[PDB]
Amino acid sequence: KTFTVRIVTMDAEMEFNCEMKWKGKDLFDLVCRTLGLRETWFFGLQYTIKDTVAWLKMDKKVLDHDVSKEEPVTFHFLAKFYPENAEEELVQEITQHLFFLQVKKQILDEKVYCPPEASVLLASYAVQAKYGDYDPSVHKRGFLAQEELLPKRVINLYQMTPEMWEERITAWYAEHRGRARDEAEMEYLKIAQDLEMYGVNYFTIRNKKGTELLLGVDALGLHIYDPENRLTPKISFPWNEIRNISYSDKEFTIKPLDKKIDVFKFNSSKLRVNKLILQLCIGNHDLFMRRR
């Protein structure tokens, strides 16, 4: 027979009837075609098993995955990789739009840090995209009163009332007259992409001396952070300056192309997480080279 799956995107919900033998590719190619999304390499189908994310493997049967099989079997369509330059790599309208929504939520949920002034400018493009051009006779004072435009973090940094925020965002909003939906969403993305925590996947690790650290895996390379500073890495390894990443048991080794440069090894305990890290290393490395 068939089994029903529910597919969750950033703004919609879909439901598909899958033959029992369907691999990830069957389901994934179908979702992308339905969306008219052509830059498929950025995206994947996500589910979460015991507080660790996992991605649908293409060459694997949907039901051989350890996703909860209680109907409907649910997957979240999300970007797994991020482009180095959004304006140039995101061509389809739906693609730009789903990145916009995935990134905006990261910011409002404070998963991606952004300075107060960046959050105000980002909000103004967000409202421009949703409400179109400004018109003071239609969008009367108080029309953004219940709209969620800023991270709670920035409003707890200022002696400012909500009306003061709304007044400030509206002024910047008015500055974007003439900008179409897609244009405002792309502008939002251009600002967001320069943020330090943008597009980076963080994993807690330990160096051989036993010191607890963070691994950052993003489009440009591997990064090592002190756990209290996710903004600025202590060490970076660009993808082109890396010879190989080997994995064994719970130990990673980063081997630089420059043989005189010491090797960097670290441990991670959870093996589900280590599999994820490798996919993210492999995929990001591939896209990095193919762009060059």
Binding site: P116, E117, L121, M160, R168
Partner: peptide
């Protein structure tokens, strides 16, 4: 774009907000 650039706008926004803390 009357604010010129994003690089300028971010600074305009930061300094006009700076009097609150």
């Amino acid at each position: 774009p009357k604010f010129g650039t994003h690089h300028k706008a971010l600074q305009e926004i930061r300094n006009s907000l700076l009097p609150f803390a």
